[PDB]
Amino acid sequence: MRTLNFNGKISTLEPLTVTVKNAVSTSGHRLPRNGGFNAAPYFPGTSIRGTLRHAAHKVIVDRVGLNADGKSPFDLAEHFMLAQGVDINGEAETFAPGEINAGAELRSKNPLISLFGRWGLSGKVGIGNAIPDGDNQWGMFGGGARSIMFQRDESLMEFLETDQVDRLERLLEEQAEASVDISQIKTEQDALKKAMKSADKDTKAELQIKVRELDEKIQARKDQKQESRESIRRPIDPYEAFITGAELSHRMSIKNATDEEAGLFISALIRFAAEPRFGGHANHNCGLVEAHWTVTTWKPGELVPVTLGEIVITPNGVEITGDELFAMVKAFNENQSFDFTA
Template sequence: MRTVKFIGNINTIQPVNITLPNTKGMPRSQGRPMIPASSLRGFIRHCAHEGITLLFDKHDKPMDIDFHYLLASGVDTGRVLGVSGQNTKVGANQQIRAKHPMLSLFGYWGLSGKLSVGNAVADNDNALLKVNAGARQHVFNRNEELSNFIDPSELDRLQDILDADKYSAEAIADYKAEKKELPKKIRETSDPDEKAAYKQRSEELDVLIRDAKDSRVGASESIQRPLEQFEAIDAGQMLPHRMLLKDPTDQELHLALWSIAMASLKPYVGGHTNANYGEIHAKWEVMVTDIDNLTPKSLGHVGFNDEGFFHTIEGFDVDEITKQIVDGTINIGSFVE
């Protein structure tokens, strides 16, 4: 019976943008923007998976698709483990955990991961940044001199593309604006016939938008169009953050620390990375309690910054864990029972 807590902060070095399904703008908790737990847990897990992938490739250890899905997503595509949440033999989960510490740490379908990762919620009311992404422009409008470097016979075709793009973009904008208003009209009316008519019009507009794109000269997507505004947590924000590791073995604890080391190699989360969004730094104090020590005891600190991965945890050696992963002392890829 042992609990390890990671208590610290995540710092946004660049703005962080997160997009979730069915969520407008940045995810929020009690009105404040946050980096959701799912994004942070996925960030750590996928960095660990990529680190293992590179190590195995470097040492000529083949990996199949089932291997990747299990480590990265917790999906047993090959049904090689034979354990599910609906039909589990007594003791089967303990056997899986003992043999596959990385899966025990992050989990897979039917086996809960021991590492719980919390949301990182901004504690500053001014943390939210609204970004006007500008507009995407035709390269020949941006730099008219480029027309001197194409064959004169192409100029008419170029003009056709520019004209068609302009006119279809205007039509599509009108269609989208009308479609955007329909959900409100559906909510406001109690007449079932009106609701049906609005839904039918929405489907018609989808067809009109698709047809307008398909009929374009050149690309189906408009080159010359405004880019949508988006929200982000601004750079320079300190977000309190916690993680919990439930009853880990020493090996599982060291794998969790090693996974944070792998995360330091790609320390960014979320979208718009082409604009250098998403870079973060992090630092946690690692606290442990067990049956003999009910008062939390600090094991040290772990995290990453511009100087890379750092820790002050006695007995943990990132290079030794890497060596054990490669030589099989820590079982990562042997999934056949």
């Protein structure tokens, strides 16, 4: 039973972005910032926690393997218990509320539910956020334009048959005229948003519904397009990411740890290193990270950190350092009495 603090740096190999509803607004896609636009963005610890929980779930799946029938032994209930800790079939040990150290049997038998908790059983892994070290380590990456393929490469028109070349011509015509119509409607809409600022509240009971009916007219016009519902020539909005090679300070911890739980966590890190991806926009290879975690623990009784080893995940390999981390991994690999089902 040792509290393992993985204090370390995440160096970003490809830009690291995440979409959070509150952070993202109409003005554009922005990272969680904890303050104004001038504040410092942080990559959520929730995204890293979920990614590592998924990695641990995959490690558990591989260790369990498949049945003789080639199907995972886990059903939907067990899968959602291990993946997001939600009991769907209402069949879970509803531990009494006032014992902190409750569920020791489930913790021993299920190390995944131990590290990352279920509903009603506090998890042992607190995965903190990847805080950037610098001042200009974020940027509006992505961005571009979904270009009409045949208006860029003329040779692609030699593949289109005339009964489809006229279809393309109709599509471009409809896109253009629907887009100037939507532009006019948007011009009325923004003029109305200007007029909102002189609100006397006699008009406002009408103005917002007028705006809504203009949005409905926009949707109707988009529906009116017979050949393509959405304009193809779209300028892609940029997404805010952490720059390539951004050194983000990361603090992760496992609370009091049987060798098996820590071994499962280290195996989850070793499997995450196969695809070290945090966040979305994976189309642009976003999220690829390499991170060195100094695994410190607390001396028994004394308030001092002793360094047990280092977890250096890099594209070239995972360098587990320290004999004790190897011992934890070996303990997890052994002790095959785990019963992840229910």
